[PDB]
Amino acid sequence: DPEVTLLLQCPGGGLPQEQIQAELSPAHDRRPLPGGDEAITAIWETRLKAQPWLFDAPKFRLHSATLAPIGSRGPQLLLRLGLTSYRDFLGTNWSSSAAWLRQQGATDWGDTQAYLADPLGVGAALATADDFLVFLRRSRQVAEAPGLVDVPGGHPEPQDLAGQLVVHELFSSVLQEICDEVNLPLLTLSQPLLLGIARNETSAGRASAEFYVQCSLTSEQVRKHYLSGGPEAHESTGIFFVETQNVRRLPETEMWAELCPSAKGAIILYNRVQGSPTGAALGSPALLPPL
Ligand SMILES: CNC(=O)c1cc(Cl)ccn1
Q1: Can you list the positions of beta strands (E) in 25-145?
Q2: Which of 191, 196, 226, 221 is nearest to 208 (CA)?
Q3: Domain membership flag for residue 283
Q4: Which residue intervals define the domain Nudix hydrolase in the entry?
């Protein structure tokens, strides 16, 4: 799977909000382009003169994420974050020249991402009360990953002593994205656990935080809530469900070739962090079938 790389695998089955610190700093921002940020401005102008209803929005930038020594007390993860924008994304990661920017960042800064917007995404492995994960089909008419399978998520817009408010907005945003797109009541959702961070090598290495969320409704009830919104209540064109039993071998199925990179990251991290039992009971052959 060359289109997805794991940047972080969380310990202990995944991390709750109270165990994560963020450092939001202009030291974590994109570096100005070698020939100047006028190249980004020019791409944006061209785009607005064809689609004048488009708007810019601020986004979080991932610089890096450092895990504490395993088994330790106190905060377990430090997220180093900057600020970027949808406009900066369109002029860097989305650019035809994105590979040239990665090579220049290696040369100039010893950092393939130094000249990339790298907006932070969020995604969920969302499990039902009857033990299915939730999948969504993308429109065949959108610019990114048309017609592919996705999981719930999005790219949060901003608004440890401003750090804890930033971690809160990240955890809040994955629940909000489930309520907005799947049309589930907020009171049917667990507090999220962070599973890890995955990079999309098809979009020049931009990263998504991947979470586990449990719903108290069954697959049939989740379907009813999604469909009862009508075609205008969701950006996706369909919902479907796979038994957690069968997620284990998804990379061996014909579905795998249809998953967008950030959804592949969510399923790999679900399989490594929530699946793959460590103890004698769940690791017994009748409960963990060989092969
Ligand atoms: C229309 N696309 C988006 O809203 C989007 C925004 C960002 Cl920041 C990254 C990828 N896609």
Answers
A1: 58-67, 77-85, 121-127, 132-137
A2: 196
A3: no
A4: 117-273
Cα-to-centroid distance, 93 and ligand 1 (Å): 11
Domain count, the chain: 1
**What are the Cα distances from residue 64, in Å, to 82, 151, 187, 207?**
10, 24, 33, 10
What does residue 100 show for φ and ψ, rounded to 5 degrees?
-60, -40
Which protein residues touch ligand 1 with a CB less than 6 Å away? 59, 86, 89, 119, 144, 155
Q: Which amino acid belongs to residue 198?
A: A
Q: Tell me the residue range of the domain where 207 lies.
A: 1-277
Residue 288 lies in a domain: no
Structure tokens at 63: 């610089």
- Per DSSP, the three-state class of 52 is coil
The DSSP secondary structure of 230-261, one letter per residue, reads: -GGG-SSSEEEEEEHHHHTTGGGSTTGGGB-H
Tell me whether residue 168 is annotated as binding.
Answer: no
Q: What region, left, alpha or beta, does residue 170 occupy, with left being phi > 0 and alpha being psi -120 to 50 degrees?
A: alpha
- Report resolution (Å) to 1 decimal: 1.7
